[PDB]
Design an enzyme around this catalytic site. Structure first.
Site, mmCIF file in Angstrom:
data_model
loop_
_atom_site.group_PDB
_atom_site.id
_atom_site.type_symbol
_atom_site.label_atom_id
_atom_site.label_comp_id
_atom_site.label_asym_id
_atom_site.label_seq_id
_atom_site.Cartn_x
_atom_site.Cartn_y
_atom_site.Cartn_z
ATOM 1 C CE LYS A 205 -78.478 -77.031 -41.823
ATOM 2 N NZ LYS A 205 -79.498 -76.497 -40.875
ATOM 3 C CB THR B 62 -72.237 -69.659 -39.582
ATOM 4 O OG1 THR B 62 -73.265 -68.819 -40.105
ATOM 5 C CG2 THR B 62 -71.153 -68.781 -39.048
ATOM 6 N NE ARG C 258 -78.452 -76.295 -48.392
ATOM 7 C CZ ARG C 258 -79.232 -76.170 -47.326
ATOM 8 N NH1 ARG C 258 -80.500 -76.544 -47.357
ATOM 9 N NH2 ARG C 258 -78.724 -75.665 -46.213
ATOM 10 N N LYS D 296 -85.469 -61.714 -46.272
ATOM 11 C CA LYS D 296 -84.118 -62.285 -46.158
ATOM 12 C C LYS D 296 -83.159 -61.580 -47.089
ATOM 13 C CB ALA E 4 -84.556 -79.547 -46.734
ATOM 14 C CG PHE F 125 -85.511 -78.575 -42.965
ATOM 15 C CD1 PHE F 125 -85.656 -77.193 -42.866
ATOM 16 C CD2 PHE F 125 -86.367 -79.273 -43.820
ATOM 17 C CE1 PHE F 125 -86.602 -76.531 -43.623
ATOM 18 C CE2 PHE F 125 -87.316 -78.611 -44.569
ATOM 19 C CZ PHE F 125 -87.436 -77.238 -44.470
ATOM 20 C CG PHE G 279 -75.466 -66.413 -28.837
ATOM 21 C CD1 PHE G 279 -75.326 -65.901 -30.125
ATOM 22 C CD2 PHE G 279 -76.409 -65.840 -27.992
ATOM 23 C CE1 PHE G 279 -76.109 -64.843 -30.557
ATOM 24 C CE2 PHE G 279 -77.196 -64.784 -28.421
ATOM 25 C CZ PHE G 279 -77.047 -64.286 -29.705
ATOM 26 C CD1 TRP H 266 -72.123 -65.163 -36.864
ATOM 27 C CD2 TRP H 266 -71.305 -63.881 -35.221
ATOM 28 N NE1 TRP H 266 -72.779 -63.953 -36.912
ATOM 29 C CE2 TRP H 266 -72.300 -63.151 -35.913
ATOM 30 C CE3 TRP H 266 -70.647 -63.275 -34.142
ATOM 31 C CZ2 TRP H 266 -72.656 -61.849 -35.561
ATOM 32 C CZ3 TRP H 266 -70.998 -61.978 -33.794
ATOM 33 C CH2 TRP H 266 -71.995 -61.280 -34.503
#
Ligand SMILES: Nc1nc(=O)c2nc(CNc3ccc(C(=O)N[C@@H](CCC(=O)O)C(=O)O)cc3)cnc2[nH]1
Lengths: 557, 555, 140
Positions: free
Chosen positions: B70, B72, B93, B104, B272, B300, B380, B408
């Site tokens: 989302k 990206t 954010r 992560k 969220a 989300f 993709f 991307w």
């Protein structure tokens, strides 16, 4: 006459620190600004000037603390300013304050009155993030220890032997003794632990003793967290935490360039406890400052029996420094408290109590000479002091072979520091120091403690609980016995009894407990009970603090 | 060709440049090094009446192990718009530190659509979170100290809802007992820690209009109750001044940039579910004056972030979103079609055509707020042309413009097709924004109009605890507040197993919590994880930094 | 309570059965209405003092040991039953019994008189046995 302390800090005209830095010979690409009045200086400055000679090193210390107050940092800043007014090329290096006190009793200026480092308000709060860096490096390890158990406990730790506590930078007593890991199998391992205040973190001491970031990681790898069931120590290295902790501190390792009201450049960097630690600012800041300047003022926490001792016997030991002089800060009133006069009655002239309390100062002076360092007393001038008192006090300093100067830096900034500065320069020019740590590492812990205790505290000898005797046996057995020693003791007496003011004779230290900081690289024998996490008072300052729609901040300082 | 790599190789413009590029003076910028800075609130106050530019909410279809991307797409739309000569910035954010040490440590966005410097953003950044952490924890300590001092307010330590926070994944701190050691040491009580981004104080930062509104909010925060049942607030503890103080800097948004030097704000970053997953109102409302175009996002899928974006963030700030994007993948829609994660390289034109009902619901939902929706189909390598083409048609037959987006890979050039569709939607498709509900309803009617219209549920149920908690909340005059549904993000329903577009179901409200400081009610359907934990092989163990500042193991 | 105290001692001595203390279902009992004992934390004070864990007390008549007495045919049947009482689990998820701790002979010992029913009478001298007395919800 004198405006309040926060008032003076508003009306300072501060130079852009970038300027001060090019003035010292620092390049723009070694400067990371935090706004325009704070910067973080690269360790590459030191590395490229490694072969230059050091400036002179001047330690500022103080006689035994008291209710009466003595003002050590006020003297340091205004000593630095006086030096600058005499054309000398000088910096001061100082410790960052813990955020917590700002909301309980304090906060107050880095220094005081007309002798301050600034911006005041940033220094008392988050400053450049050094303490959050420490807070999160410390707590990650805690959280790695705890996760370790949760995943099947391969290192076979005993959770009840865990000494690595958590930290937070607030005065919160309810966090002293907690039980974590409750809620069931999915949620950790029930165990007894607690929080200390962040500046009292061993991670804070490592930053203040490390030579660079790689040395700081190395040290992190030797931090001991707990033991196995068989009794073997378990380290952070063993948990492979040090790279991450090092990562969290990559900016924190850089000392912070700021200035005094009179625009004299100053480093604030690190800031540990001075009982369970050594109460000095970073080696990193002080070593960098010795290349940039021909003169460096720094201070140490509590009295000269503690900070000054630990400044010499730990900070210089490691950095290989050789102080050139040391200033002992004293007040006519504290000397009288040491002479037996109660708080309320300290304005009344009393030459008897002054002379009898002078023994506190005489014993410190003698202690400084035991390291081979020339000593100059600063007298913090106070309006109640009579001339007959001030004069008696000079005779006495003189009788004891110390130069002395009255200091009015609080009221008169650097001008009030010039008599003193001239006595230092005069001392530097004609009594070069012959620096010697008080003791050799290859003594035994009990030997190194007695040395400190008998030579510095004037203690007859030392006693040891069984728990102490056992720790020592065990530590000495793990090969941590050829480490330096960091006495945690009340700052309010030479002895371990805070009621014994002045120069107590015929007494004895008692060591209740011995802890270890394998990261920092020292042993911590403890005499009283140390408060590594103080609490807020009944009417805490947080209740009166505010900030309005134009950012006007009442209730803080 | 990896993401951290691309982050090193960025030619970063100094931040100061962009600020004055946007019409910010030298004196409204507090630099943190050359490539980060904080903007003053005076920029908003002095352009108060200048016109907002356009507001472009990015959202996404229902999350999945397929990982829709989302952010990206938000960064790559911002880059596109800039290549079309449009004065634009993005607002995103700030990520929690903690995850960087668990699994992560990712790009703000991805590939060639990033906001930089990536590594400071994932770490201490400009200290916004430590400001939060300490503002939260001060208050906790203030509560505990109160009790120590005779408990004048006559609090029941067992009613205390105000927990502590730390921004690490530390599951051992979830449930603890504090205050042990005896009369000198506090008052024994059960409590716990929550990750710092889950703080109400983080929520407040992200909704507060200015520093004084942030303070006022803090004043209304509820920490627990008295023995009689009377709520007790931070206001009662005279804490709000001290909390506001610790946030004087954090309240300012942080200017940074994209890989193609497009100015970006990163400010705030809340949960969220128990919160509304938007970046700060401050950052976007400053960002509205500094550009004709503002892209932003919400956490989300659109049923949560987007609903709460509209019904909370916009309500409070009085915004009117001009368009909305809904990101989707072909593989994510195929998971919603029933195909498992392992098999999604395989073409499957039916599964994509039963899975598309998810996106078709979201789009119908965006239409309910009176907002023009545009789809982005995050491209993709394994996607067939028949698949992609079936998707266009389905978006078309649903009455939504759609575009392929290769950000991307292709940077801001990949996002031109979308960026045009948006500007075409903006030049001719004017939004008529309307919050889904009115505050003057009763709590249960608000949950219902949420549950029905958006989640497509038949109705809502309530445990005894929920009915009683509502009874009481409504009884304390907190009934007239917005509603922030704490539900699993993996379904429209409260069941994470129900993919696609579930019909003929119900929501069940187990529990209801309050955030009088953030000013909303939080109904809970699942159990919410407010403190995740590290995994078995954590990333802190292989994270390392060497003598040259080279960092392995992080990303 | 002996079993409880045997479970707890087991952990203290190196935990050979490799129990997970957080999976322990065998609670303590006392025969008073004392709510404060519902949810406690035991084994605090350090390595010399047990293993910190979350547990609690039930009222004695609600003890599974009470139900075994009320269902056993004799003392040897009562011991057998005791040996099958499950206290907790291992880390791998296998159950651990009182039998596994070899507690049943001692528990049996403590009940050697208890196994005998008690002869009493009604006001009108009609003979009556009072013996056992379990809960009728979590037991019979
Ligand atoms: N916190 C605090 N610290 C201070 O140092 C302080 N100092 C003053 C002003 N202090 C003083 C101190 C001494 C003389 C004084 O009697 N000076 C002697 C000179 C002594 C000598 O040179 O021998 C004189 O009469 O000139 C005057 C003002 C006011 N408030 C303070 N408050």
């Amino acid at each position: 006459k004198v405006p309040s302390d926060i008032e003076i800090a508003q009306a300072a005209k501060m130079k852009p620190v970038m300027e001060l830095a090019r003035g010292l010979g620092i390049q723009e690409d070694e400067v990371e600004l935090y706004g325009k009045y704070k910067a973080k200086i690269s360790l590459d400055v030191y590395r490229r000037l490694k072969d230059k000679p050091d400036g002179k090193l001047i330690l500022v210390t103080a006689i035994t603390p008291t209710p009466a107050g003595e003002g050590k940092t006020t003297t340091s800043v205004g000593l630095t300013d006086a030096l600058a007014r005499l054309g000398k090329r000088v910096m001061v290096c100082l410790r960052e304050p813990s955020l917590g006190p700002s909301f309980g009793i304090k906060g107050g200026a880095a220094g005081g009155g007309y002798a301050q480092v600034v911006p005041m308000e940033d220094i008392n709060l988050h400053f450049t993030g050094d303490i959050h860096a420490v807070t999160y490096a410390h707590n990650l390890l805690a959280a790695m220890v705890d996760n370790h158990l949760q995943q099947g406990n391969v290192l076979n730790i005993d959770p009840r032997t865990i000494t690595w506590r958590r930290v937070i930078d607030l005065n919160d007593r309810a966090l002293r003794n907690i039980v974590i890991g409750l809620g069931g199998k999915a949620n950790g391992v029930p165990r007894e632990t607690g929080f200390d205040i962040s500046v009292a973190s061993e991670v804070m001491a490592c930053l203040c003793l490390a030579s660079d970031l790689m040395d700081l990681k190395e040290r992190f790898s030797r931090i001991v967290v707990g033991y196995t069931y068989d009794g073997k120590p378990v380290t952070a290295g063993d948990l492979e935490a040090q790279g991450s902790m090092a990562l969290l501190m990559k900016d924190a390792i850089k000392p912070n360039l700021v200035q005094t009201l009179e625009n004299t450049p100053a480093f604030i960097h690190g800031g540990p406890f001075a009982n369970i630690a050594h109460g000095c600012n970073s080696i990193i800041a002080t070593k960098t400052a010795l290349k940039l300047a021909d003169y460096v003022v720094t201070e140490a926490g509590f009295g000269a029996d503690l900070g000054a001792e630990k400044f010499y016997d730990v900070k210089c030991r490691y950095a290989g420094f050789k102080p050139d002089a040391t200033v002992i800060v004293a007040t006519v009133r504290a000397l009288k408290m040491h002479g037996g006069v109660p708080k309320s009655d300290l304005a009344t002239e009393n030459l008897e109590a002054l002379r009898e309390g002078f023994a506190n100062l005489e014993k410190h002076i003698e202690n400084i000479g035991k390291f081979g360092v020339p000593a100059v007393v600063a007298i913090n001038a106070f309006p109640t002091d009579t001339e007959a008192e001030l004069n008696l006090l000079y005779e006495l300093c003189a009788k004891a072979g110390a130069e002395v100067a009255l200091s009015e830096v609080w009221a008169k900034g650097g001008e009030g520091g010039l008599e003193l500065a001239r006595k230092v320069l005069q001392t530097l020019e004609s009594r070069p120091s012959n620096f010697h740590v008080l003791y050799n590492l290859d003594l035994s812990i009990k030997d190194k403690i007695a040395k400190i205790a008998t030579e510095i505290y004037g203690a007859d000898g030392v006693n040891y609980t069984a728990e102490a005797d056992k720790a020592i046996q065990r530590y000495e057995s793990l090969g941590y016995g050829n480490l330096p020693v960091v006495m945690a003791k009340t700052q309010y007496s030479f002895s371990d009894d805070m009621t014994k003011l002045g120069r107590p004779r015929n007494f004895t230290i008692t060591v209740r407990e011995v802890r270890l900081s394998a990261g920092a690289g020292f042993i911590v024998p403890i005499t009283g009970a140390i408060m590594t996490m103080p609490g807020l008072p009944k009417r805490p300052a947080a209740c009166n603090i505010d900030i309005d729609a134009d950012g006007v901040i009442t209730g803080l300082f």
